[PDB]
Amino acid sequence: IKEMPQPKTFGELKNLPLLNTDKPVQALMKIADELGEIFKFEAPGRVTRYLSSQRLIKEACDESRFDKNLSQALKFVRDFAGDGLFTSWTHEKNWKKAHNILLPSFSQQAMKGYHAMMVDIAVQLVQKWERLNADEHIEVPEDMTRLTLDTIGLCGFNYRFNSFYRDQPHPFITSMVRALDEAMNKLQRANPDDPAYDENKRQFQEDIKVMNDLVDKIIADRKASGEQSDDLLTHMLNGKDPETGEPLDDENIRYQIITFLIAGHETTSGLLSFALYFLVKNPHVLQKAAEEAARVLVDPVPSYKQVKQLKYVGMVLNEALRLWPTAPAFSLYAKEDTVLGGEYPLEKGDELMVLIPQLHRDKTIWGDDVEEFRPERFENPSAIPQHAFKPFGNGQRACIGQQFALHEATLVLGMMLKHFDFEDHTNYELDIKETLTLKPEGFVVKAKSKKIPL
Numbered sequence: 001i002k003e004m005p006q007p008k009t010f011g012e013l014k015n016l017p018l019l020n021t022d023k024p025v026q027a028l029m030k031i032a033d034e035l036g037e038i039f040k041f042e043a044p045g046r047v048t049r050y051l052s053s054q055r056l057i058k059e060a061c062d063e064s065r066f067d068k069n070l071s072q073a074l075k076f077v078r079d080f081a082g083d084g085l086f087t088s089w090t091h092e093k094n095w096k097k098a099h100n101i102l103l104p105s106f107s108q109q110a111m112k113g114y115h116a117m118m119v120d121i122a123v124q125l126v127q128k129w130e131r132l133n134a135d136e137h138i139e140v141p142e143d144m145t146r147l148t149l150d151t152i153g154l155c156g157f158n159y160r161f162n163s164f165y166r167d168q169p170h171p172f173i174t175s176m177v178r179a180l181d182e183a184m185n186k187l188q189r190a191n192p193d194d195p196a197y198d199e200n201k202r203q204f205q206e207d208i209k210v211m212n213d214l215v216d217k218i219i220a221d222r223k224a225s226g227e228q229s230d231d232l233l234t235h236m237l238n239g240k241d242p243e244t245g246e247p248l249d250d251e252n253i254r255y256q257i258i259t260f261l262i263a264g265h266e267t268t269s270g271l272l273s274f275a276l277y278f279l280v281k282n283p284h285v286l287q288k289a290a291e292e293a294a295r296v297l298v299d300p301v302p303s304y305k306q307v308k309q310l311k312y313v314g315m316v317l318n319e320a321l322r323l324w325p326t327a328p329a330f331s332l333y334a335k336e337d338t339v340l341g342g343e344y345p346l347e348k349g350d351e352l353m354v355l356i357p358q359l360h361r362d363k364t365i366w367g368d369d370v371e372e373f374r375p376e377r378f379e380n381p382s383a384i385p386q387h388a389f390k391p392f393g394n395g396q397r398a399c400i401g402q403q404f405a406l407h408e409a410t411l412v413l414g415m416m417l418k419h420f421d422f423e424d425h426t427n428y429e430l431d432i433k434e435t436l437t438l439k440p441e442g443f444v445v446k447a448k449s450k451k452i453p454l
């Protein structure tokens with residue numbers, strides 16, 4: 001039995017002011033580098049423990065011992081994401097119900113159905129870049145966010161956000177981004193009942209209303225038309241849970257669609273942005289990935305089967321997820337009294353945080369070169385130990401979107417590498433912006449067309 005280290009305290013505020021930063025995950029990573037595989041983190045009326053080693057995380061990922069916790073961030077996002085899949089407890093009836101109904105909608109097999117819609121948005125991205133003038137550059141996270149938001153709108157509910165037709169976001173997106181910023185800003189507030197925050201609260205309720213109003217209208221419009229489009233909204237209006245025999249009600253469907261729109265906007269766009277960053281910083285890797293894209297994507301429109309052959313592009317995406325897992329932390333609670341790692345006794349209900357970027361830098365697993373971008377680490381997936389690599393979380397509460405995100409990201413990165421050469425024309429210095437997710441802020445490149453027709 002060891003005593004856990006704890007970072008610096010602020011009297012009665014304990015560790016809470018360490019999150020008074022726009023980069024809380026990066027702060028926690030630097031604390032992990034100083035303190036090691038486990039540290040205690042305290043706020044008024046809150047204790048959690050941050051885990052960084054595969055040795056401890058492999059136990060935390062034992063579903064017989066630990067279940068998904070809603071962190072303070074997830075409790076605040078639940079105010080507009082409700083009991084959708086991401087912000088539900090495992091024991092809530094609507095978690096297992098929605099999970100059983102939606103799993104077949106998110107399978108590898110289902111990606112054959114979504115492919116044509118993904119190609120539609122991906123071709124819009126390639127056409128935007130083809131149409132740039134010689135003097136112009138690409139705003140990488142901006143364009144990747146235009147893409148991922150449009151892909152989930154179209155595959156989700158046959159709705160065109162038309163992000164490539166706009167400087168300024170759809171009204172839904174303005175409310176969604178402002179609601180997320182408010183949820184994330186609330187974490188570090190030592191005094192949240194302060195009247196300074198009355199404007200925030202009035203605005204928050206207005207953004208929740210806007211989100212509910214468009215999504216409720218889209219569900220109502222689809223029920224009215226009777227149209228049977230092959231999208232997630234159709235699957236949710238028609239689907240029945242084999243266990244309860246019930247369908248999802250319209251309120252839960254609204255929380256699922258809100259959840260899927262946040263995920264598409266926030267997650268896959270980050271992965272693609274980090275992938276392009278690492279490619280332009282590692283020209284040998286860029287060359288190897290571009291040879292594969294040229295050899296495999298022989299048709300003007302990529303096919304589902306062709307995207308599955310992009311093995312090296314998949315390895316690039318996994319190496320980007322290793323260094324900068326886009327959704328970098330998840331929360332667990334002890335189902336019963338238990339001893340973590342033969343050293344740290346926990347009581348039933350005790351919370352753990354998994355610091356995925358730190359897990360991904362465990363030198364006992366990956367070797368001394370952990371900071372280097374080497375997709376070849378992923379050449380043989382069998383060589384990666386259980387629970388060493390967890391960008392999609394864990395067990396039955398793992399990312400339902402994983403096949404969808406990797407299919408979209410592989411298709412789009414394949415087409416980018418086929419159609420363009422890329423220049424890091426500003427020698428961009430990595431600056432990682434944090435919301436729920438990570439993105440490389442201010443990342444810009446120039447693309448030179450290889451002039452291959454669509």
Ligand code: HEM
Pocket residue numbers: 068085086087099152259260263264267268271325326327329330331391392393394396397398399400401402404405
């Ligand atoms: C690169 C992209 C993505 C990454 C890295 C990512 C990562 C994650 C992770 C780490 C979790 C677990 C959260 C936890 O334990 O608290 C999760 C859950 C989830 N993700 Fe993703 N995700 C991605 C894309 C998507 C997309 C595109 C969708 C949907 C369109 C999606 C939908 C979900 C849902 C619904 C959950 C909750 C699943 C459940 O608990 O039943 N994700 N994701």
Ligand SMILES: O=C(O)[C@H](Cc1ccccc1)NC(=O)[C@@H]1CCCN1C(=O)OCc1ccccc1
Pocket residue numbers: 019024025041042043046048071072073074187327328329330331353436437
């Ligand atoms: O929200 C939390 O409880 C903790 C931070 C915290 C706050 C108050 C006291 C003690 C700890 N959150 C986190 O450690 C991380 C970093 C910032 C947000 N966050 C988090 O888990 O966000 C939710 C999330 C994001 C992505 C995937 C799943 C869940």
Ligand SMILES: N[C@H]1CCc2ccccc21
Pocket residue numbers: 086259260262263266267327399401436437
């Ligand atoms: N994909 C998960 C991980 C990050 C995130 C944010 C919103 C909704 C779902 C999710």
